[PDB]
Amino acid sequence: MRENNTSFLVNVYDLKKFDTYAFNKVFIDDYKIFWINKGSAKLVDKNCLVSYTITASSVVLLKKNSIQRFSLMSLSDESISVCVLTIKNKFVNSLRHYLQGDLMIRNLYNEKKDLLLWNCELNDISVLGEIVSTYDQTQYSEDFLKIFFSGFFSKVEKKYNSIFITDDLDAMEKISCLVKSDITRNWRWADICGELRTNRMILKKELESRGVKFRELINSIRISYSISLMKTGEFKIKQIAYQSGFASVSYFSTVFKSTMNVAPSEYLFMLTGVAEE
Ligand SMILES: CCCCCC/C=C\CCCCCCCC(=O)O
């Protein structure tokens, strides 16, 4: 029996005609890129107060460890499919140490942009479409894709003077890794700074730049954790809530609905296509 893909996750979601998805403080737990298959949609980035029209030749890149606030609204008179490619941590590591030589200008890039737009050449459209076409690819060696994505992320970074793939000494990565190492623990802000051996200073900068309080950040990480659990095959809402560190199903559901603008059971239906029972 062939095995699940170790480098990527592919999830496709139906965007009904003229409907809107709205995300409020969603934590991006891994690097993600997404695109629509046909038609057009309006993307409103509420972090930057910038609006974009995307088409089938656009790809939107979401930075790991960012907190996103945006909406996506279908502009088409037909159902649209949103394809979300998650790049897994094992694979991103390979990318950090792949590109030959030292890129001299990258030290003067900045980290201000967490949502990036790229208008694809058909080269890119071909490769991305084949990746998501079927669970295995086979015709795409892992090395081919490592070369492709390191070159792909390189040119997006150069369009924006911005670091997309960060080093793993990043303070926000250390925080989110620590929280997820014990997701049901009642984390306190002073405990995290203590265990990371970094005072409540450079760490506070990470909350401020994302516009969240500590308790908001923990809730956002826990929602992203619950979505990861649902993707593993866990479909019992009580188990999803408790394993993600929520005190009750009621509160999980309220936070989930505030973050994703749909109820947990609705998201489960979008994910699996199976209505309950
Ligand atoms: C938060 C990233 C979603 C980007 C794509 C938005 C398009 C359709 C909304 C359905 C997806 C809802 C969140 C998906 C969760 C995930 O796959 O990580």
Numbering used by the authors: 1 to 277
Share the article's original sentences.
Toxigenic Vibrio cholerae causes disease by producing the primary virulence factors cholera toxin (CT) and the toxin coregulated pilus (TCP). Most AraC/XylS-family members, including ToxT and AraC, contain an N-terminal regulatory/dimerization domain and a C-terminal DNA-binding domain. We present here the crystal structures of the V. cholerae master virulence activator ToxT in both the UFA-bound and apo states. We have presented here the results of structural and functional studies of ToxT that reveal the detailed molecular basis for the regulation of virulence in V. cholerae by the UFA components of bile or synthetic ToxT inhibitors.
We solved the 1.8 Å resolution crystal structure of wild-type ToxT from V. cholerae serogroup O42 strain SCE-256 (ToxTENV256). The asymmetric unit is composed of a monomer of ToxTENV256 in a closed conformation. ToxTENV256 and ToxTEPI are superposable, with a root-mean-square deviation (RMSD) of 0.432 Å for 204 α-carbons. The N-terminal regulatory domain contains a nine sheet β-barrel with three α helices on one face. The C-terminal domain is entirely α-helical and contains two helix-turn-helix DNA-binding motifs. As with ToxTEPI, ToxTENV256 purified from E. coli with a UFA bound within the hydrophobic pocket inside the end of the regulatory domain β-barrel, at the interface between the regulatory domain and the DNA-binding domain. Tyr13, Lys32, and Lys231 in ToxTENV256 are analogous to Tyr12, Lys31, and Lys230 in ToxTEPI. When aligned to the structure of the AraC dimer, helix α3 of UFA-bound ToxT is at an angle that precludes dimerization. The recognition helix (α6) in the first helix-turn-helix motif in the DNA-binding domain of UFA-bound ToxT is turned perpendicular to the recognition helix in the second helix-turn-helix motif (α9), which prevents it from fitting within the major groove of DNA. These results suggest UFAs inhibit both dimerization and DNA-binding of ToxT by controlling the positions of α3 and α6, respectively.
